[PDB]
Amino acid sequence: ASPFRLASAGEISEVQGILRTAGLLGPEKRIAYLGVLDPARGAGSEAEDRRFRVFIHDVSGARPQEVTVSVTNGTVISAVELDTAATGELPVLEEEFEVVEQLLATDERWLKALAARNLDVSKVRVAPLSAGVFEYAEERGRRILRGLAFVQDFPEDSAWAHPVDGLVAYVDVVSKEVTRVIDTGVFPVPAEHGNYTDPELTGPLRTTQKPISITQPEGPSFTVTGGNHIEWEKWSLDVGFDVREGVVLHNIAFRDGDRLRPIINRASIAEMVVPYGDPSPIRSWQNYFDTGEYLVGQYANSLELGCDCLGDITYLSPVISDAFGNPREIRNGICMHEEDWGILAKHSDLWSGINYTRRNRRMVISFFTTIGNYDYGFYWYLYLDGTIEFEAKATGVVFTSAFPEGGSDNISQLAPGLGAPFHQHIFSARLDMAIDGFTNRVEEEDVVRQTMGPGNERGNAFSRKRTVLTRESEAVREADARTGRTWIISNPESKNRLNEPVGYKLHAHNQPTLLADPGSSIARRAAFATKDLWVTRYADDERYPTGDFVNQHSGGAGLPSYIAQDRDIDGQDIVVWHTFGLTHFPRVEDWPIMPVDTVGFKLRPEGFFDRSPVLDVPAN
């Protein structure tokens, strides 16, 4: 009954039928993106209109189309031809991954480069890398992928251990032309293997780990109704899934007594970028937006019980469309479980004699995605005390290069001859806030140091200051760890029992933002990544910090264009966009497969409740 339910196989088949009947999905068409649209502001009409947005690619070279479909009424709502030279290309198709390698294997310039290196072309894998926008005028309006090569000594070999440096090719995947092959010189192909399942590399496996058993003899404390509605320890929310963003959280709310209080209308990771800091011409163009260009949701793993998710696990299996509009299930794509989380609160009082201890727990909602060499886990946590936390776990295999003779200022050496270019992993969380409703505002809170003097004779005082962000033009903010800077989202029209506005405080990790030169192509295309915090006024069509079509867009779309409208955000329907990321100088310990590193953020109640919300938690 819920308009926020997951898309079903039947809905996707109906979309495919509507498009077919309308003449929009013939045999030369491919679906590059398909997703349900959220209800507009004002779904209180209960008139359910399940609408889907579709990006349709044309393999014959005709212009692509953005189509909106009403599955409820069986109609096409709108269909617009896209000018990709102006507004950007469609996301990379899974079926284009092979095309780079296959085209190159019959190009004379590529074959000559391999022959000079004594490489068998049947061993050479080619990574299909997004192109970006640089100095090649001939690429504007064309669908380009760039290719970097790795040697596979045998079919179960890890190709990442054998980069072929000094070589890169550009391919037009629609017209099937190799447009350029660039060979800056021969580098030795690193010879050591990186096969982390080879007993010669691992040695004998440890026998010292004894089992840890986590069970729930009465089952879990959360309930799932309607397929994707979760109720857990006064929290209520809907778990969505989008092929671009992955897991999306809707209608996060907290039952405070008899009253269901909204906190967040929609939470997602709306973009992620991995820019590389190696100035070599072979890789200086390399920045992939795994979300916006590749769509991380369509690469979600099936998660195995007792390996990926441990404990009493409830799964969701989201449905997405393949390139022809057929439904395909991602079996066990989302894991859902609660975890013990240590001490919640504890006091032994010298005067009252009362000893008091309570335990914490958190609800975990997660998925894993794999795009090429990298693997990422996305984890949302809900805590008993009202805290909401996000954590990204980065693992997989680092992207490699040769390590030059005489060293490098921009590459780490991992093994003899083997390098790993410096890079960042930068995320954008899009938080459509609804603190006690939709009239919200953001204040920047700084610690204030005070000088010794009158009214502060002992020089011990310190304070804090809050600055309201009133218009979008002043709502692009930077971190300041030294002054303890945080941001508070409050509802100036809803007060707690002390007559203060209710709020939530955003705690950032204060890691470095985008390091590239502000005049670079990547600074223009990933402008969101240059600042820690952006606040916009809510609009239906402002969904991604980089715009709708990231692939080969020249720059400036998304957040810089949104905030230029300079709209009123003081007690309005607002959206918080938080940039956070890891700066990765690879270490020897990251090779041949990298242990998880993490980054994220959290939101804690700030006078949202009238006292601690966990006084009613029982003793274990």
Next chain:
Amino acid sequence: ASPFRLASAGEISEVQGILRTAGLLGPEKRIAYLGVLDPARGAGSEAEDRRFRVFIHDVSGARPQEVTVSVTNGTVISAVELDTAATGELPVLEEEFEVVEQLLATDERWLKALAARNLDVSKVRVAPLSAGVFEYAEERGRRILRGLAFVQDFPEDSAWAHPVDGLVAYVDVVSKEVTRVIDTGVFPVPAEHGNYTDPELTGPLRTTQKPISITQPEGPSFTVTGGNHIEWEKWSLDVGFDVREGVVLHNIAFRDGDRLRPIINRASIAEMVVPYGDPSPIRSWQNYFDTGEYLVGQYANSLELGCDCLGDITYLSPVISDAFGNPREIRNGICMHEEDWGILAKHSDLWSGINYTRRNRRMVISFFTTIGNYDYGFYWYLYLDGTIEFEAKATGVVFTSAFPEGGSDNISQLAPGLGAPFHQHIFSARLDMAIDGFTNRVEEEDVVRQTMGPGNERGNAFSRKRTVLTRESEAVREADARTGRTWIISNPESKNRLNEPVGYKLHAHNQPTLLADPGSSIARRAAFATKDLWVTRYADDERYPTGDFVNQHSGGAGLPSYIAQDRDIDGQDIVVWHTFGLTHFPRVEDWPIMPVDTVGFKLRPEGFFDRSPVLDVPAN
């Protein structure tokens, strides 16, 4: 057999006997501190000399004594009379907690202040707060406590909800004189109770939490030998316990193949300070060093199975001395267990077809302490991949005041009439490093941004720079979150297979340091807390960042005096002191008992190993 074993009841009884026989422990003497001394550098003689350091207080007013005892040979090694006016007073005695309230209850000025407020003196509890050093010349050389009052409506009432503001008293606890009573005016005593076990406050307890069962059907993967030596997943270490510092980690080392490699010689939290930022004369003197002044180890809780520690738990029960030299056990004072910790490493490879997943776990060593209103958990974590992490968990009851009419810039309002002054909780970790041995150095690592130009035509490059700290005078460092600043401890004489020095990287949380004016008394006494990182050359007697006798020391002892020696630290036996802390602006949700907040730091291998150290972990 190990010189790092825990003190036993028999050893403490022998210390008591040696002191008695030597004439040093008559009936007017009290032991204010007793602890075993670590072996000197060069214990390879195997000549075990178990030595104990003792601070002996004299209740008759004679000068106190520092005594060193050899329990092995049954001799007093040294006994020095202390000039407390010069070098500081001894730590607060547990038996002095009562004395403040009892003396005040017969003082006419105190009784008059209570009568003006219509307060029953039999209801008024008085907190025994450390005095610091301020403008009262008459306190130099005297053992002073200051008292702040709270009303207990009945014996099981939480007194913290009823602060008596506008009133403070100073007491000489040796001569039993009330030296001053200060009454700046009447404030209403907040009337609401804060009794978090009162069903009228909690409402009916939740029935929705179902059990989480964590068991180890084959027992734990770690072994304990010799009472306190731990072996777990290639880690080896000794767990010590000191009445001042609490849990101390010794000889942390990692078995890399057939070779046992040292990492950290001694790890402890060597100080902690809670400075308050309320400029009111009633509280502007208030800064307690829970470690240095009160000794957090002697207030360690007995931890209950299934409440404080959940899972397959191994306990230690450390032994300490009471004020007369009798052994007393802290039953179940240290919990020890391993925990599942999610995904360790994961990759699904598009070219090799291999799917690979491994799970992480951590070894946990923790204790909890309670000093008055506050409770703290100290957690050390060891991870499979070589990471070492510390986490402090702060909970308990916030220290309260009245909330003034018309508001305050330095106090939060928690309930009608009830305030909580702003404060910080600042810790000092003392890390006696031994990375692959004792020849170590520290480098400060910053991200380096690069400008668009020749050699960086696309403006994408970025790098890093490392600066060696060569002398103590340049080894007082500040955080810089914006440039991603970390610190690497390396051994320039031990190289990994890539011929780079082995190292470990220290990752700080980059929270604000001490906020008080640099000319204040607390900035001088807690100088360690003004900077994030200090490096000293190892010396036997340089144990605490604040000096040996913190109580009523005028300032400058400890780290500023150590680093003034300007010793060589480039490839030497060094000690890293890391300051980290929480800045606490209390929120309504912290009342009436506060949910845990956390802070800490971690160290990760940086080219310590020749590849990932967890390739030999088996599939679950």
